[PDB]
Design a protein around this ligand. Structure first.
Ligand SMILES: O=C(NCCc1cccs1)c1ccncc1
Ligand SMILES: O=C(NCCc1cccs1)c1ccncc1
Lengths: 300, 237
């Protein structure tokens, strides 16, 4: 079990850690979050009580270093930093625990939610989507735009998701125009899976990461990427059976976890209705279809 | 963006453009089978591809053999249309290729867009106009060449005949659309109006009779009258 200590909490902020969130008051005594489960990526995110705009946060993996949070009064935000002095870090964290100045990551034992949402997400892939190689952790916020979004302006601050475009030369083989547009299997399996992602686990990891950024930061371009990666699978007549089964589990826990009051903006009516009811895979997503119908029958 | 009553005059500027109408590509007769079931029998069709500035009608005949052994023919027809339009553009010299293609039905947009990926600077556009190009098969010479075809075939016509020697392309397009609107709303009457007079001839390479200017005014008036009457009948107004 690992710890992300906080130097202090100068400004009133709602802090999230994965799917949990708590409030800290201005200058409240507070020195971080303990008992964070090893073995998964994690995200620690912030929304200032004075600016409900700009949710922001940091993806990290405690196996990759000792990380702490410190408020910057010049840039006005809670910054993740790495401590290279192992002994100095243990001592800080030991003191703060003894003083009982840390909230505990509140995982229930029966609960596999976070595992299920991050199963294929790997910190090394996040850092290729979010390029800032001097840090072991990755910053994301509500306003960051995607590479594809940019093509339609600052590159250093972009989400480098794999560009999917169903009306592109990459997606359409010359001479197979109609075939490839109505059956995206060759774009999915040859171009994306074999070509770019190398395997389905990396594909699913980008899909899961896009959803999580959409959910936690309201990052619109991530939402577009998540829907696009769902639609590419659903619009393919030929998909490995192991992928369909795993997609159904992936989407089930995403739909399960989505805040009810955000379904209107986070869920694209057209994509979901097409995927669950018109696409080749309309009958391959039984758990996802069952939860969507019982929880958001309005959308459909 | 979409083409409508407001940017109507863009059709007659000097940016090359083409209209594509696919309404006569896949044509069937519906009949009963011996067992009392219903079946279709395809007949030859055509893509109607028109430069509204010159009157150029690239008429691509779609022979029934193209449907042999294929499923979902109404859907295939849209892709076949897009394939043939793309092939036409590729065959044209660069300086004759359109800068825009306007499709008369929105369902042609994705098929043409996909077939034209090699021409990213050709805009594919829909229209809000209710253009009557489906009535093209009411023009006898066009119907005749489509039905007689025994193989795929592209046939050329000037759908304006020689009109542009005396009138503008705006006026020529308005006359053509009036003629086709009439033939669409009441083909028999429309045709009676155009051929009533045995003394007015149709040139070998022309589709329409050789009316003087004054005779065109009488004709156009009579076509207008036809269209409005039929409309009163339609809606009981
Ligand atoms: O409440 C305590 N633990 C911090 C957790 C927090 C709960 C909600 C936001 S911060 C506590 C109280 C007093 N002295 C030491 C520890
Ligand atoms: O002027 C004609 N041809 C060249 C202009 C065009 C090019 C393509 C279609 S019309 C023409 C006229 C009458 N009948 C057949 C052809």
């Amino acid at each position: 079990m690992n710890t992300v200590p906080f130097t202090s909490a100068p400004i009133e902020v709602t802090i999230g850690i994965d799917q949990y969130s708590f409030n800290v008051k201005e200058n409240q005594p507070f020195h971080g979050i303990k008992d964070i489960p090893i073995g998964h990526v994690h995200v620690i995110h912030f929304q200032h009580a004075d600016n409900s705009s700009m949710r922001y946060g940091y993806w990290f993996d405690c196996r990759m270093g000792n990380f702490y949070i410190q408020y910057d009064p010049k840039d006005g935000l809670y910054k993740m930093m790495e401590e290279r002095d192992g002994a100095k870090f243990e001592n800080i964290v030991h003191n703060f625990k003894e003083r009982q100045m840390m909230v505990s990551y509140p995982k229930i034992d029966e609960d596999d939610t976070w595992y299920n949402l991050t199963e294929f997400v790997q910190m090394d892939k996040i850092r290729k989507i979010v390029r800032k190689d001097e840090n072991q952790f990755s910053y994301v916020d509500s306003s960051m735009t995607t590479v594809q979004e940019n093509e339609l302006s600052d590159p250093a601050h972009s989400l480098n998701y794999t560009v999917i475009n169903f009306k592109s030369r990459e997606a359409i083989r010359p001479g197979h125009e109609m075939e490839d547009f109505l059956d995206k299997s060759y774009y999915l399996n040859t171009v994306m899976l074999q070509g770019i992602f190398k395997n389905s686990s990396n594909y699913f990891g980008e899909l899961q990461f896009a959803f999580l950024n959409a959910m936690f930061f309201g990052n619109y371009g991530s939402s577009l990427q998540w829907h696009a990666m769902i639609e590419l699978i659903c619009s393919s007549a030929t998909v490995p059976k192991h992928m369909l089964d795993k997609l159904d589990e992936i989407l089930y826990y995403q739909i399960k976890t989505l805040p009810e009051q955000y379904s209107d903006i986070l869920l694209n009516e057209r994509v979901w209705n097409i995927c669950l009811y018109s696409s080749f895979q309309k009958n391959s997503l039984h758990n996802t279809e069952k939860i969507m119908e019982n929880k958001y029958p309005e959308l459909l | 963006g979409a083409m409508n009553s407001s940017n109507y005059a863009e059709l007659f500027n000097n940016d090359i453009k083409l209209f594509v109408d696919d309404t006569n590509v896949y044509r069937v007769t519906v009949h009963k089978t011996f067992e009392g079931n219903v079946a279709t029998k395809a007949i030859n069709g055509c893509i109607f591809t028109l430069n509204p500035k010159t009157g150029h009608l690239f008429l691509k005949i779609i022979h029934t053999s193209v449907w042999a052994g294929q499923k979902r023919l109404s859907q295939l027809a849209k892709w076949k249309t897009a394939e043939e339009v793309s092939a036409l553009v590729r065959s044209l010299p660069k300086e004759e290729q359109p800068k825009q293609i306007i499709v008369t039905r929105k369902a042609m947009l994705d098929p043409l867009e996909v077939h034209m990926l090699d021409f990213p600077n050709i805009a594919i556009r829909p229209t809000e106009l209710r253009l009557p190009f489906s009535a093209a098969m009411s023009i006898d010479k066009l119907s005749d060449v489509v039905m007689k075809a025994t193989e795929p075939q592209m046939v050329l016509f000037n759908i304006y005949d020689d009109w542009l020697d005396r009138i503008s392309s705006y006026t020529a397009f308005s006359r053509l659309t009036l003629l086709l609107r009439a033939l669409k709303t009441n083909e028999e009457s429309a045709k009676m109006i155009l051929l009533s007079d045995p003394t007015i001839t149709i040139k070998s390479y022309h589709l329409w009779p050789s009316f003087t200017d004054e005779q065109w005014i009488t004709i156009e008036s009579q076509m207008r009258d036809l269209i409005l009457t039929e409309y009163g009948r339609k809606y009981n107004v």
